Design a protein around this ligand. Structure first.
Ligand SMILES: Cn1c(N2CCC(C)(CN)CC2)nn2ccc(-c3cccc(Cl)c3Cl)c2c1=O
Length: 477
């Protein structure tokens, strides 16, 4: 599923009309509805059924169905599990979209781009802009090296062409056709390697980009959201019968190739995040997986834990208590943990824990638990100062420990708030070491982490909050 079934700016009225006139029974599509909710419109018996999907920051909650990490994994799960979307709603045919506003190469209204392709381009860098001469047409500009070649795209009766050959129904179809079958000039091969990178900016001009995005963020986010279809890696171990009861959410599973493997069964819903600092993104402990959680902490030689949720929020359980009370001592299987001391700030609480395996004495080490408590149940924090001060302390606690393993970060499902903290921590590590003269690329970093765990960064509110945190860290330096 190449995300073509998601229409970025279509109304519910238009969604029904597209299914009635250009779709048959079993045809479906997705659209953004309430800012933050989505809609799954499916055709059945000549009627259209609108299923609601809510995402407050933790997961995609399909009304009357299970909870998923991405909309692509949601569509994939139901296009292979017939009879589970209820009378049954079958997902057979994706009704594809033609709006190029979410494509990386589409820049819309742009002046005759020669500067952009020169100051920030390489061989194969290309873009598609609207034509300034003939209104309605488009232009495809490609850098080749040395030179910047322009190719007209004529629009004729809701179809697109480059002056000859096949007429396409979508600019995306035209671009995808010439990415594999490049145009050869009458003397040069206009290869469409990668789209022009207009998101890599200098750390000094981050405040100027936020100003341009604030009057913007939504368009860049859904451009990253469209590329999630390239991340449907296998999650087979989590689907095994022995591991079904080990996941808090049955359909939010770790990638097979990045999962943490235990050697003491070997399953735990967790993934290694590699961007010198590395991370472990996992879910909140279940009652029957606390013993496995401390197996992972001991195995990976982790000395810091970042908890970004309360045990109970909104009356619902997010994580069971896997740490002893202050001064207590508990055994979780073969692992013995003692709560040495608790230091409480405003936004968080530090818990100095000592973890060791039973029977072996010289295996003890201090594990520093950081429990962020002031995170809002609805949305993201207004000011990033508290989170920035929280991550700054966690970083210096990590750097003071020699040969310390990865940093364990978790919330509820371990993808929403967990991905936001880890991405912010990665971007700051560049600024703290390479100063302000470095380049940062927010959507590229999120895609790099989303390939290692399904659904890192869940909402646009978190996406904009990541930009605000980076901008705030610059201005206070
Ligand atoms: C050029 N560009 C654009 N713009 C072209 C499209 C927009 C909407 C103008 N109409 C904004 C600028 N938005 N954008 C969002 C994410 C990524 C991205 C970056 C690196 C890797 C990957 Cl996988 C992705 Cl998805 C990009 C991007 O590269």
């Amino acid at each position: 599923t190449s995300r073509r079934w998601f229409h970025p700016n279509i109304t519910g009225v238009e969604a029904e009309n597209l299914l009635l006139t250009r779709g048959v029974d079993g045809s479906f599509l997705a659209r953004p509805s309430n800012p933050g909710d989505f809609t799954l419109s499916v055709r059945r018996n000549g009627a259209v059924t609108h299923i609601k999907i809510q995402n407050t920051g933790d997961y995609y909650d399909l009304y009357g169905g299970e909870k998923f990490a991405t909309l692509a994994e949601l569509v994939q799960y139901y296009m292979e599990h017939h009879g589970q979307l209820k009378d049954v709603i079958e997902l057979k045919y994706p009704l594809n979209c033609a709006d190029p506003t979410s494509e990386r190469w589409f820049h819309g209204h742009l002046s005759g781009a020669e500067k952009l392709l020169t100051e920030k381009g390489k061989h194969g860098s290309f873009l598609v802009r609207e034509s300034q001469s003939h209104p309605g047409d488009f232009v495809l500009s490609v850098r080749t090296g040395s030179k910047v070649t322009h190719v007209m795209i004529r629009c004729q009766e809701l179809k697109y062409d480059v002056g000859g050959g096949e007429r396409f129904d979508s600019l995306t179809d035209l671009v995808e056709h010439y990415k594999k079958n490049p145009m050869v000039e009458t003397l040069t091969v206009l290869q469409l390697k990668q789209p022009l990178n207009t998101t890599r900016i200098n750390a000094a001009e981050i405040e100027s980009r936020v100003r341009e995005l604030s009057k913007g963020f939504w368009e860049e986010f859904e451009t990253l959201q469209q590329q999630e279809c390239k991340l449907l890696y296998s999650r087979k171990e989590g689907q095994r019968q022995e591991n079904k009861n080990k996941n808090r959410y049955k359909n939010i599973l770790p990638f097979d190739h990045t999962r943490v493997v235990l050697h003491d069964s070997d399953y735990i819903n967790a993934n290694i995040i590699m961007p010198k600092k590395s991370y472990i993104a996992t879910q909140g402990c279940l009652q029957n997986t606390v013993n496995d959680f401390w197996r992972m902490v001991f195995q990976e030689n982790s000395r810091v834990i970042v908890m970004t949720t309360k045990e109970v929020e909104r009356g619902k359980s997010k994580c069971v208590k896997y740490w002893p009370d202050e001064y207590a001592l508990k055994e979780y299987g073969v692992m013995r943990v003692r709560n040495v001391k608790e230091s409480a700030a405003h936004d968080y609480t530090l818990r100095e824990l000592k973890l060791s395996k039973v029977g072996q004495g010289n295996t003890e080490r201090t594990v520093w638990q950081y429990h962020f408590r002031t995170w809002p149940d609805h949305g993201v924090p207004s000011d990033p100062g508290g989170v920035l001060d929280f991550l700054e302390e966690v970083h210096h606690k990590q750097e003071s420990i020699m040969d310390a393993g990865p940093v364990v970060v978790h919330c509820s499902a371990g993808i929403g708030r967990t991905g936001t903290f880890i991405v912010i921590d990665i971007l700051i590590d560049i600024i703290r070491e390479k100063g302000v003269d470095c380049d940062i690329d927010v959507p590229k970093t999120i895609q790099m982490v989303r390939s290692q765990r399904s659904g890192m960064v869940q909402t646009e509110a978190q996406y904009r909050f990541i930009y605000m945190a980076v901008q705030h860290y610059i201005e206070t330096l």
